[PDB]
């Protein structure tokens, strides 16, 4: 037998439903989302870190000239200066006070500490949401991992299920992402090759060992003024470090919907948002026909004190009369009240106490026992606490969210005006008919 | 590496709201976020005792 439903995607909250197959006895169905994993598809644009500004040992053409070559280092920078006449600890280094050129050379490579200290730039696309479900029907309680897309079926032992598509697609990752040492950030890093000095991603490469590293750090060489040989240079600060300081908080503290971010691969677990349509083919073997199940004769509902809170702050009692000892399923046929227990051992005659939670100020909801329906009427007080360590297990609607006292006052106040305008129209019509008849 | 564990905060509840009394001899990070459409993410380094 195939059943369709729409389960709220809130990990840690059972959802209960009843399947009433006409031939068979009613069966319970409680569904829990044990875990979710929203994982996107990503491609690595580049990696970046602190550049090491390496400066090759300078060469001098002692009484001649030199020309700047065209190398393929990262941010490669070469200049030639005129007569320098350098000196060393050994002493003078050349024999021409003029035309004693020097060639200044500098470029960058990855710092030796970049192996651990580096950042990866990724792009994300549409993310596919995968869910692990624990689903119980009657006694069976198998689990299963499935993809929530509306197409791919999550075949289990025999329980077949299709889920989705998600009611509202959502992705915590913006279009561009950066992942550094576990932490995730949403930074619109500049594209590959578009290095700008002094900002994030000033040096980029396809991989740590890749030799085609490209960078633009605005390095510039100056004329050596002191007569000791040395090459001076000034360069913008490492934009990688600038970003590290101005990073802001990571996404583990900023992703919405209470989502716990994890890496390797990039993913978003336990993310509570939207509704998941689930269609499930429960096998008929677990079904039991009503000729063998106990059909109860008479049940009534008496509700104790109740309170509307996330916790199970409501209690009630069922006085029942049935025809056999068995395992009838109990259920709530309202969206604003959910019971705790599902199956109760039922006798020929007796009573059962149950717990429930509601969101509505009044419990005005139908309880069903093995198909027999009875209306519970109650009046739940406001909760005494202010904060709980549990999530609210049931949504709060509008219709069953105002007490019948308020409802009666509102309906009286509106019905007064409605009846008054109706009576006024009727009076005008009647006056016209009386004038016409006695004219 | 070992890292310290801050003094456990004292939580005072109130209607749609909480109050953390905090004590931290050294700068401790406090990070809060909502579980809805808007993160409303907040970060603050706190020293001393405050609310």
d(CA A63, CA A267): 64
d(CA A405, CA A298): 30
Coil, strand or helix: which one is B42? strand
CB pairs < 8 Å spanning A and B = 34
**At residue A186, what are phi and psi to the nearest 5 degrees?**
-100, 85
- Closest chain B residue by Cα to residue A388: B13
Question: A55-72 in b/e burial notation, b at 16+ Cβ within 10 A?
Answer: beebebbeeeeeeeeeee
Who among B16, B31, B38 is closest to A253 (CB)? B31
Binary contact (B35, A256; C-beta < 8 A): yes
From the CB of residue B4, how many other CB atoms can be counted at a distance below 10 Å? 9
- Closest chain B residue by Cα to residue A387: B13
Report strand pairing: A366-369 vs A326-332.
antiparallel
Who among A257, A385, A386 is closest to B36 (CB)? A257
d(CA A395, CA A338): 11
- Which pair of structure tokens corresponds to residue A149? 């897309």
**At residue A218, what are phi and psi to the nearest 5 degrees?**
60, 30
What torsion do the CA atoms of A382, A385, A387, A392 make, to the nearest 10 degrees?
A: -40
Question: A12-48 in b/e burial notation, b at 16+ Cβ within 10 A?
Answer: ebbbbbbbeeeebbbbbbbbbbeebbbbbebeebbbb
**At residue A190, what are phi and psi to the nearest 5 degrees?**
-70, 150
Binary contact (B41, A253; C-beta < 8 A): yes
Would you call A385 an interface residue with chain B, using a CB distance cutoff of 8 Å? yes
Contacting A with CB below 8 Å, chain B residues are 11, 13-18, 31, 33-39, 41, 43
- Closest chain B residue by Cα to residue A171: B37
For residue A290, what are the β-bridge partners? none
**At residue A216, what are phi and psi to the nearest 5 degrees?**
-140, 95
Q: What is the 3-state secondary structure (H, E, C) of chain A?
A: CEEEEEEECCCCCEEEEEECCCCECCEEEEEEEEEEEEEEEEEEEEEECCEEEECCCCEECCCCCCCCCCCCCEEEEEEEECCCCCECCCCECCCCCCCCCEEEEEEEEECCCCCCCCEEEEEEEEEEEEEEEEEEECCECCEEEEEECCCCECCCCCCEEEECCCCCCCCCCCCEEEEECCEEECCCCCCCCCCCCCCCCCEEECCCCCCCCEECCCCEECCCCCCECCCCEECCCCHHHHHHHCCCCCHHHCCCCCCEEECCCCEEECCCCCEEEEEEECCCCCCCECCCCCCCCEEEEEEEEEEECCCCCEEEEEEEECCCCEEEEEEECCCCEEECCCEEEECCEEEEEEEEEECCCCCCCEEEECCEEEECCCCCECCCCCCCCCCCCCCCCCHHHCCHHHHHHHHHHHHHHHHHHHHHHHHHHHHHHHHHHCC
- Which pair of structure tokens corresponds to residue A311? 């916790």
* Distance in Å, alpha carbon of B44 to nearest chain A alpha carbon: 10
Coil, strand or helix: which one is B10? strand
- Only one residue has tokens 């100056």, namely A222
User: B20, B41, B43, B45: best mutation site toward chain A, by most A Cβ within 10 Å?
Assistant: B41
Q: What is the DSSP letter of B7?
A: P
d(CA B28, CA B6): 8
- Residues of chain A positioned with their CB less than 8 A from the CB of B1: none
């Amino acid at each position: 037998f195939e059943h369709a439903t729409t389960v709220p995607n809130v990990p840690g909250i059972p959802y209960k439903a009843l399947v009433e197959r006409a031939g068979y006895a009613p069966l319970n169905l409680e569904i829990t989302v044990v875990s979710s994993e929203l994982t996107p598809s990503t491609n690595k644009e580049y990696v970046t870190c602190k550049f090491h500004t390496v400066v090759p040992s300078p060469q001098v053409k002692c009484c001649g000239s030199l020309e700047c070559k065209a190398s393929s280092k990262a941010d490669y920078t070469c200049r030639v200066f005129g007569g320098v006449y350098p000196f060393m600890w050994g002493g003078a280094q050349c024999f021409c006070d003029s035309e004693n050129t020097q060639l200044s050379e500098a470029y960058v490579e990855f710092a030796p500490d970049c192996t651990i200290d580096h950042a990866v730039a990724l792009k994300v696309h549409t993310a596919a949401l995968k869910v692990g479900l624990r689903i119980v029907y009657g006694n069976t309680t198998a689990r299963l991992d499935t993809f929530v897309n509306g197409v791919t079926p999550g075949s289990s032992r025999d329980l077949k299920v299709i889920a989705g598509p998600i009611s509202a697609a959502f992705s915590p990752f913006d279009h561009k992402v950066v992942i550094r040492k576990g932490l995730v950030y949403n930074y619109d890093f500049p594209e590959y090759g578009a290095m700008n000095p002094g900002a994030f991603g000033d040096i980029q490469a396809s991989s740590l060992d890749a030799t085609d590293i490209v960078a633009r750090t605005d390095i510039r060489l100056l004329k050596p003024s002191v007569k000791n040989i040395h090459v001076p240079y000034t360069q913008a600060v490492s934009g990688y470090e600038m970003w590290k300081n101005n990073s802001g908080r990571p996404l583990q503290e900023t992703a919405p919907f209470g989502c716990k971010i994890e890496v390797e691969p990039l993913r978003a677990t336990n993310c509570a948002y939207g509704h998941i349509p689930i269609s499930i083919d429960i096998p008929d073997a677990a079904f039991v026909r009503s000729s063998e199940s106990p059909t109860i004769l008479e049940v009534s509902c008496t509700v104790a004190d109740c309170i509307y809170s996330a916790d199970f702050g409501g209690s009630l009692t069922l006085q029942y009369k049935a025809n056999r000892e068995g395992h009838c399923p109990v259920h709530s046929h309202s969206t604003t009240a959910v019971l705790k227990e599902a199956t109760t051992h039922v006798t020929a005659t007796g009573s059962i106490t149950l717990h429930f939670s509601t969101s509505s100020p009044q419990a005005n909801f139908i309880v069903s026992l093995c198909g027999k329906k009875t209306t519970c009427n109650a009046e739940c007080k406001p909760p005494a606490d202010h904060i709980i360590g549990e999530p609210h297990k049931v949504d709060q609607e509008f219709q069953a969210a105002v007490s019948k006292t308020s409802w009666n006052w509102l309906l009286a106040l509106f019905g007064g005006a409605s009846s008054l305008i109706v009576v006024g129209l009727i009076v005008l019509v009647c006056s016209s008919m009386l004038i016409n008849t006695r004219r | 590496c070992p890292v310290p564990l801050a003094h456990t905060p004292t939580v005072t509840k109130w209607f749609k709201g909480i109050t953390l009394h905090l004590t931290a001899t050294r700068p401790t990070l406090l990070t809060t976020r909502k579980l809805g459409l808007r993160a409303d993410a907040t970060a603050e380094w706190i020293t001393g005792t405050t609310s």
